């Protein structure tokens, strides 16, 4: 009859800015790595920009 979905009540936004807006990037031979998890990531902005 109806569709339901559940998730943790309170969650923090993923910090995509710190990697996408990093003041300076690294070289190709030393490409920079950053892990992210346990945070809500909004992928809409990826194709909405």
Ligand X SMILES: CC(=O)N[C@@H]1[C@@H](O)[C@H](O)[C@@H](CO)O[C@H]1O
Q: Enumerate binding residues for ligand X (CB under 6 A).
A: 17, 20-21, 45, 49
Least separation in angstroms between residue 6's CB and ligand X is: 28
What's the closest the beta carbon of residue 38 comes to ligand X, in angstroms? Answer: 21
| Discontinuities after residues in the chain (C–N over 2.5 A) | none
Residue sitting closest to ligand X (CB): 17
**Closer residue to ligand X in complex, CB, 11/42:** 42
Give me the count of residues in the chain. Answer: 49
Taken in order 14, 20, 25, 28, is the CA torsion positive or negative? positive
């Amino acid at each position: 009859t109806e569709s339901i979905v559940r998730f943790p009540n309170i969650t923090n936004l993923c910090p995509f800015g710190e990697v996408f807006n990093a003041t300076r990037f690294a070289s190709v031979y030393a490409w920079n790595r950053k892990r992210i998890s346990n945070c809500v990531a909004d992928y809409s902005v990826l194709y909405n920009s």
